[PDB]
Amino acid sequence: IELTQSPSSLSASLGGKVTITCKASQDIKKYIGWYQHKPGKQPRLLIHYTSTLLPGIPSRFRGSGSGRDYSFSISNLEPEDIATYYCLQYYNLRTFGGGTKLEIKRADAAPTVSIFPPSSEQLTSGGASVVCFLNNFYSKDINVKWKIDGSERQNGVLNSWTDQDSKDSTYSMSSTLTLTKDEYERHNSYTCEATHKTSTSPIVKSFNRNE
Amino acid sequence: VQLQESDAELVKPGASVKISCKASGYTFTDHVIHWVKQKPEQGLEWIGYISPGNGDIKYNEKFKGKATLTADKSSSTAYMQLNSLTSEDSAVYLCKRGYYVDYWGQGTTLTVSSAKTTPPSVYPLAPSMVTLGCLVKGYFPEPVTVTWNSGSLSSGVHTFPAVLQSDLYTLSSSVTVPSSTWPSETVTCNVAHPASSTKVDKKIE
Numbered sequence: 001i002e003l004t005q006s007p008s009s010l011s012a013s014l015g016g017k018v019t020i021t022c023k024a025s026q027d028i029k030k031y032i033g034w035y036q037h038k039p040g041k042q043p044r045l046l047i048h049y050t051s052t053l054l055p056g057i058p059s060r061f062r063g064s065g066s067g068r069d070y071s072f073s074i075s076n077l078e079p080e081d082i083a084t085y086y087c088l089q090y091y092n093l094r095t096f097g098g099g100t101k102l103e104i105k106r107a108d109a110a111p112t113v114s115i116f117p118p119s120s121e122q123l124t125s126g127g128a129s130v131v132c133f134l135n136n137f138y139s140k141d142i143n144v145k146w147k148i149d150g151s152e153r154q155n156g157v158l159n160s161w162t163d164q165d166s167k168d169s170t171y172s173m174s175s176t177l178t179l180t181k182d183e184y185e186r187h188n189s190y191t192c193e194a195t196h197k198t199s200t201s202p203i204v205k206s207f208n209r210n211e
Numbered sequence: 212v213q214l215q216e217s218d219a220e221l222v223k224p225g226a227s228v229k230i231s232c233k234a235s236g237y238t239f240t241d242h243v244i245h246w247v248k249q250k251p252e253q254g255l256e257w258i259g260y261i262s263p264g265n266g267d268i269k270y271n272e273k274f275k276g277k278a279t280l281t282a283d284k285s286s287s288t289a290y291m292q293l294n295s296l297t298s299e300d301s302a303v304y305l306c307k308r309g310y311y312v313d314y315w316g317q318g319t320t321l322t323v324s325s326a327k328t329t330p331p332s333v334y335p336l337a338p339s340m341v342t343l344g345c346l347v348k349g350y351f352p353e354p355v356t357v358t359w360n361s362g363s364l365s366s367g368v369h370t371f372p373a374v375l376q377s378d379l380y381t382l383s384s385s386v387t388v389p390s391s392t393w394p395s396e397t398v399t400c401n402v403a404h405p406a407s408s409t410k411v412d413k414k415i416e
């Protein structure tokens with residue numbers, strides 16, 4: 001038994017609705033369940049036997065279906081509902097769906113940028129990394145332009161976003177530029193530029209070495 | 212009710228591994244233990260289950276011959292053996308107690324690679340409200356866990372998903388405290404890399 005889940009990922013408004021579908025390969029006779037998987041926590045059962053809600057789970061979570069075709073809904077979205085959701089047939093053995101990674105929209109938020117020099121411990125090595133955190137922003141989309149002495153540096157960068165904040169709907173993002181200790185010392189000015197929808201001109205953070 | 216899963220593992224291609232799932236807190240033979248395959252990125256995949264007592268084992272057809280489930284009633288511990296390891300078997304493995312609170316194990320990150328273990332080099336990242344950081348650079352394999360002030364700072368913390376570049380992992384973590392508290396008071400990040408048995412603290416000065 002195969003289970004086909006759609007959508008793979010979704011972005012829905014705060015106080016809005018979402019519908020996830022699962023399509024079994026055979027009649028699974030309403031023996032389907034729906035789980036909520038929050039990062040580094042419980043896969044938490046929400047709904048079993050298609051529609052039966054597990055205890056304490058709000059009225060706004062619902063489940064439907066029969067045969068091979070099943071649905072799950074959540075209306076009146078709250079930030080706390082940021083999770084990847086799975087269906088699970090337990091009619092004959094067990095099979096999960098592919099998951100639906102859910103995001104909940106929010107009011108656009110400008111990032112707090114912070115540039116950090118290489119540590120004197122890192123300069124014991126032949127490498128020197130400049131780090132830049134662009135914290136608690138919404139609209140996941142963001143360009144981090146590095147500038148060394150006013151010139152754009154594209155190679156040698158490492159970006160990573162956090163998963164969406166479960167409490168306040170923002171993302172955080174970390175960009176690390178690594179250079180050799182000697183290439184780092186050939187320059188002065190280090191800039192972490194941030195292109196986001198909330199500003200028409202980049203939120204920029206710098207430091208000067210020979211200062 | 213406890214489901215203490217075994218430690219994080221690194222193993223060469225072609226070899227085998229055994230993951231344990233030590234149950235405690237309830238009667239072992241009252242429930243089955245399922246093993247699930249976790250992601251990366253997305254997706255949980257059911258491998259199979261075992262009955263303590265009964266001995267009945269059910270498998271996913273994909274995992275028959277790949278995985279071997281055992282249970283030891285005398286020690287209340289379910290095992291999974293995984294064989295002829297390839298990199299597709301690199302994943303997090305979760306055991307679960309059959310649910311008819313629902314209890315799962317914590318996870319076991321299995322990595323299948325020819326690479327060796329490198330502990331991370333933890334670098335302090337110093338500059339109303341101030342932001343500090345730690346760069347956990349160049350380690351292998353996953354995972355790493357970062358705390359700040361031994362779990363006392365949390366809400367201003369943002370730890371970043373590791374990114375593999377040139378066969379090594381690097382993640383960073385930032386904490387944002389009021390300027391009022393640093394440097395007058397100490398801020399230290401604690402980074403653990405289980406696969407190299409290192410616990411490293413770095414005071415941000």
Ligand SMILES: CCCC[C@H](NC(=O)CCC(=O)O)P(=O)(O)Oc1ccccc1
Pocket residue numbers: 032033034045048049088090094245247257307308309310311
């Ligand atoms: C979804 C509700 C049924 C859960 C199952 N419980 C039963 O089937 C008990 C009898 C019942 O009333 O149908 P279980 O937790 O074993 O499945 C798994 C296996 C792997 C991962 C997650 C759940």
Ligand SMILES: [Zn+2]
Pocket residue numbers: 183186
């Ligand atoms: Zn140069």
Ligand SMILES: [Zn+2]
Pocket residue numbers: 237238241
């Ligand atoms: Zn019980």
Ligand SMILES: [Zn+2]
Pocket residue numbers: 267268
């Ligand atoms: Zn049986």
